[PDB]
Design a protein around this ligand. Sequence first.
Ligand SMILES: O=C(c1cc(=O)[nH]c(=O)[nH]1)N1CCN(c2ccc(Cl)c(Cl)c2)CC1
Ligand SMILES: O=C(c1cc(=O)[nH]c(=O)[nH]1)N1CCN(c2ccc(Cl)c(Cl)c2)CC1
Lengths: 306, 306
Amino acid sequence: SGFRKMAFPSGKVEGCMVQVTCGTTTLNGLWLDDVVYCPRHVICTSEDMLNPNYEDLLIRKSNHNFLVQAGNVQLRVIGHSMQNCVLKLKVDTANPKTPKYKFVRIQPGQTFSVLACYNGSPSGVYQCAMRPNFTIKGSFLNGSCGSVGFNIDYDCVSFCYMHHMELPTGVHAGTDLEGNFYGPFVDRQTAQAAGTDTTITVNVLAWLYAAVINGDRWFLNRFTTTLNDFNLVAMKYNYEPLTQDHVDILGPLSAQTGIAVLDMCASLKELLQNGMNGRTILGSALLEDEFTPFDVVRQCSGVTFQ
Amino acid sequence: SGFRKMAFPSGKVEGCMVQVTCGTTTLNGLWLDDVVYCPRHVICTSEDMLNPNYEDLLIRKSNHNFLVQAGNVQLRVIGHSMQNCVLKLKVDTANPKTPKYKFVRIQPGQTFSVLACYNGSPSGVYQCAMRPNFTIKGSFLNGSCGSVGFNIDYDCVSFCYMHHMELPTGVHAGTDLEGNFYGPFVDRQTAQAAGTDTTITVNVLAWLYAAVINGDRWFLNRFTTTLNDFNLVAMKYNYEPLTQDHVDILGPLSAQTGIAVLDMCASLKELLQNGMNGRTILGSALLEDEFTPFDVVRQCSGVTFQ
Ligand SMILES: O=C(c1cc(=O)[nH]c(=O)[nH]1)N1CCN(c2ccc(Cl)c(Cl)c2)CC1
Ligand SMILES: O=C(c1cc(=O)[nH]c(=O)[nH]1)N1CCN(c2ccc(Cl)c(Cl)c2)CC1
């Protein structure tokens, strides 16, 4: 038993991280096959940041302007191209450690592991969720651009995020691996603001189920409610509305514990209106929303990867 | 910026995990050089558990009774010996992925990363602390015995824990890599109880400093206190007393923020006596004690490993 904010083993990704330098700027890159992916803002200087024209900036660059380092080994950049907000540097050597992978663009509410890097060197790994406002609450210091977020399905590493910048409020914004930003953000150093964030209802529910699985039942009751009655209350507290798709997804957890989704919703309804009264659930004094129903199953059933 | 419960990259450890089978029992093992380490309780059966005589049990075993699997490859056990509570299986092949490592026995209050495994396959990684009562609040399911805890210093993996069992209260107990249990526990399936747990004062302080570094200052005040006056209060709330060694260790963080340790202690004193009043620090409604002063520096300064 037990319940921790578990990240995926980072081994397969560690071998793909490299250092990319362009002029005075150095950040991280992702080496898969013979291509290195990194944020395109690596080609900007102090003056270009406020409002860069990446097309002009890139055309004024030659392959030799890009220094790519894989530990001690230097990679030769034999070509370069831009795909949206990421730069793709063709190198002469194919990464022999390239795992089976794919690129996926995730939806808000989904979670993934982040491998924070600096100078192409992995510093740590942590779990987090894509907030409804398309930002993530990460932990990044100067030099972390290029760090990636991923998930693991059996033997395939699914990359879903590349780190680009930090917003004034301290939250982070980035893109998928095809260079499309998550959210209404652009890679310019202009002051940008994220929309208002909401709580991920379906995740809080999955977490209450984990609590029940781990012996914490104090918040349960005999009542029930309807999807309509619940949503009315949820919206008053900045919670995402709950859909029928959410209800089905929570099925496996409902079966395992024998508590119907709508029953659990009525308990959540009470928690929102009456607070926790100095009580805790799974060691927390707040309702947690960064665990998806799948994360709960995984940790309460023990699924492994190859 | 940002502050997350960061674990170390697990890559170097992933390559050392193997599956160990003895009869009907299968658990995880750690393969370093030509030796595989695993809990010695892998040689017990249903009847031996209540009160096993490991000496007799081991002498009745032959090398061929131990099946060691490294993925698809089977390892030949050419010898075996017992060192306290761990079994050491000499194999014919030396792990080519053996990293630079060492074994260290940690003190309560220190943190480390746990790589949870099942059938020799890494499932996830998470950070945790050795509680003052010699248990850890982990997340382990059946088949997790043999999973290890470690830290990373530059390029050296320091192993400090091997998972052995779960206590009735849901917390976990294990040994160092030399087989000595942490705490007054023994590898028998008899009902055992951990002593009362206390809060790690020095860690809560390091965490308040992280909060200050991240813009959360609401809990600060102008007051100060003396180590003596603080401890008097701390003990009334089940907090470890604070020593002068703790004060010096917190030095780097004090300098960086410009807030004296004893000033921070007076703020903590207030928090214990007046509660947080529905406020949060770094996203938490409770005082967190699983971040050491070193973990805070690392994450608020960005140290990497090779
Ligand atoms: O390394 C960090 C960083 C990342 C982070 O998450 N937190 C933090 O403190 N620093 N930066 C800040 C963003 N910068 C940047 C340069 C040009 C453009 Cl055009 C844009 Cl959009 C951004 C690169 C360096
Ligand atoms: O795999 C788990 C396990 C670990 C955990 O942390 N949580 C959980 O639910 N299961 N076990 C429980 C402990 N068991 C055991 C056998 C013989 C002896 Cl002599 C002792 Cl001491 C222990 C081995 C299998």
